[PDB]
Design a protein around this ligand. Structure first.
Ligand SMILES: CCOCCn1c(C(F)(F)F)nc2ccc(C(=O)c3c(C)nn(C)c3O)c(C)c2c1=O
Ligand SMILES: CCOCCn1c(C(F)(F)F)nc2ccc(C(=O)c3c(C)nn(C)c3O)c(C)c2c1=O
Ligand SMILES: [Co+2]
Ligand SMILES: [Co+2]
Lengths: 381, 381
């Protein structure tokens, strides 16, 4: 059931912003590793004396990488005279974030009809304000509320190219990389206590629980058309193998964003391209499931995927799970930086055609059991 | 003249350590951009709860990338019980360094006969101590003194593979990249006042002035065999075009390391390989000199380089200068990170055969005049 109870009009995921120590090096690594193009910049060469911000795009996916300059460059500025292109930015908040959590997501940004009203309504409904609505060049409005930990939910609305004050990047520095990634499917938070986190976020958004069907409990919040998907996890304590949610909270110094799931229009090509680059500057992937997992795929999805397509999943280490509505292919990277905290998921969904409805196939929860049974069977051989 | 006045026995440049916010992303970017292999690590997977350190190598060149974990992981430790593989490391010093300077070089490390005696003698001769000698696993001794700004000169000595506590990296994560870079030729500091910087460093090392022959004055300190080369620059103020040394000091918040010159055994291949990767995660280069600069090369070095070799320099944007002893080919990257501070030089030297003596060809100082005259001539066409 979908009660469609959004308290404001929400469109789609707009962008994800990483707070970094050096935005240049993170952005160049991610660009090569994920096949994203340099699309826009706001830095010293555009008159920004406050922060360096570089935007990568692939299809509709937008990754923003921001780091602070020396405060000395902007010491004479005040907020009314700021050269920052993102007015919510603050040197002290950014350094403290990165000092505390390491490299990670500061902002999950969604495009809304009216960022000011979304902010007003959210705060009227319990959201903790982080940055009030600010209108950029009479053209774009941006506002922020606390989501969990030090992550903000950022609202953006356009009267009618990323943000005012950003410049298009020179063609020569913009190499048209593309490994098939097209959009953000969902963004996942880790918290110590799922209940209060859910109540808070669903409280101020009107997002509803999205129906599902070790080491965690989780629930997914969704917008009216279920294209904005915000799962949240808590750990399950005192188990056998220590909870990876608990490991996250320890190394991250508390709650924060756990993984970003990026939809590919051709997950075979995406993973071929990402895996060729894993050891030359790109991203590493979790160890592949054993061959027993792929033998078991015939009985589970043999009607969806041919044997050759299954052998292709085996080559690339792809996981497969299935709903009552659709089928999903997925794989997880190793952590994106030094700490065992944030990682990336690549996802492609089969089914639920009407366009494709969101969450088609679910989120792969059945793969914990399947991989475990596969592990037992592989030891048996 | 070389008075050979080293106060302790110095061998060669050993490694350069970058202090980072996330060592993983900087190291992966540099590896792809410069063609350096992942050689060793010290991190959570090796039992280091304090810092993440990753070593890249190409030939004899060693780049170390280090970042701090959350202090909470090592809160129960004391220095006698530390899990840090580099005992001079300190969370607060590293965060403060990076907060203040951004991404840059913390340590210029030279291999000496006896790091304890080198430290003792240096401090007896005016060096400011930074970290005292510590013997690692009865095998390697490391000590540090202040060089300029927040950069240290690190002494390392071996009784008889990088440092104890580091592990060799798994073959699969170690892709054998190689674009021809072989060793560190020299490492250059920027300071507000050259005189006191020179007197201090030459004071405690015994390094002598290495004979030479806009915006800067400079001088080069050298070890006995002139294989360790430490140039230092100060700005020249009130000019026409603002001094790039002054621009460095402003954006770096004071003195620090300006550039690293990396010797290539085949600068044509190095630059071909680096330029292919500039816009896909690698490094950018300074804008090429105009064709007039390359026409003028025939009269300057036509006896050293064939016309085809000169046309190859033109293709790759390589600069050429010449001594009374030898010829050097050089090129400069754009800044390595967000700030207009540290950059890299690629260098190859022709001549001074006996092995090749250090500094053969000088450091390219004649290229300021040559490029300026070349600019005037190119506008004329
Ligand atoms: C990264 C290192 O972990 C590898 C272990 N692992 C395994 C494995 F391989 F063990 F089966 N299966 C998974 C299946 C789904 C999801 C996931 O995306 C999800 C979940 C669950 N709920 N919601 C709302 C989601 O979006 C995730 C993270 C995993 C996962 O992490
Ligand atoms: C990076 C942006 O600057 C580009 C402008 N530029 C030019 C240009 F192109 F203008 F001619 N020529 C140079 C020649 C030599 C050196 C250099 O390595 C050196 C110097 C001088 N003294 N010592 C001890 C050295 O090692 C350097 C930096 C440059 C340089 O920076
Ligand atoms: Co997921
Ligand atoms: Co140089």
């Amino acid at each position: 059931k979908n009660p469609k109870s959004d308290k404001f009009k929400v469109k789609r995921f707009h962008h994800i912003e990483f707070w970094c120590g050096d935005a240049t090096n993170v952005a160049r690594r991610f660009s090569w590793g994920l096949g994203m193009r340099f699309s826009a910049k706001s830095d010293l060469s555009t008159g920004n004396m406050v922060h360096a911000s570089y935007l990568l795009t692939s299809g509709d996916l937008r990754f923003l990488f921001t780091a602070p300059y020396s405060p000395s460059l902007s010491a004479g500025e005040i907020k009314p005279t700021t050269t920052a292109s993102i007015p919510s930015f603050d040197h002290g908040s950014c350094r403290s974030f990165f000092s505390s959590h390491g490299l990670g997501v500061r902002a999950v940004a969604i495009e809304v009809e009216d960022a000011e009203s979304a902010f007003s309504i959210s705060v009227a409904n319990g959201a903790i304000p982080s940055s009030p609505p600010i209108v950029l060049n009479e053209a774009v409005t941006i506002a922020e509320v606390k989501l969990y930990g030090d992550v903000v939910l950022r609202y953006v609305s356009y009267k009618a190219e990323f943000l005012p004050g950003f410049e298009r990047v020179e063609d020569a520095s913009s190499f048209p990389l593309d490994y098939g990634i097209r959009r953000l499917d969902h963004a996942v938070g880790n918290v110590p206590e799922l209940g209060p986190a859910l109540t808070y976020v669903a409280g101020f958004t009107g997002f509803h629980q999205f129906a599902e069907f070790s080491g965690l409990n989780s629930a997914v919040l969704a917008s009216n058309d279920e294209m904005v998907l915000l799962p949240i996890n808590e750990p399950v304590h005192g188990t056998k193998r220590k909870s990876q949610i608990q490991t996250y909270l320890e190394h991250n110094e508390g709650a924060g964003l756990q993984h970003l799931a990026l939809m590919s229009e051709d997950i075979f090509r995406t993973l071929r391209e990402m895996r060729k680059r894993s050891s030359i500057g790109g991203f590493d992937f979790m160890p592949s499931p054993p061959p027993t997992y792929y033998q078991n795929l015939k009985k589970r999805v043999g009607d969806v995927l041919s044997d050759d397509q299954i052998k292709e999943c085996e080559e690339l280490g792809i996981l497969v799970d299935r709903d009552d509505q659709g089928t999903l292919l997925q794989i997880f990277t190793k952590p994106l930086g030094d700490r065992p905290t944030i990682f990336i998921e690549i996802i492609q969904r089969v089914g639920c055609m009407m366009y494709q409805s969101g969450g088609c196939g679910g989120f792969g929860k059945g793969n914990f059991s399947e991989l475990f049974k596969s592990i037992e069977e592989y030891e048996k051989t």
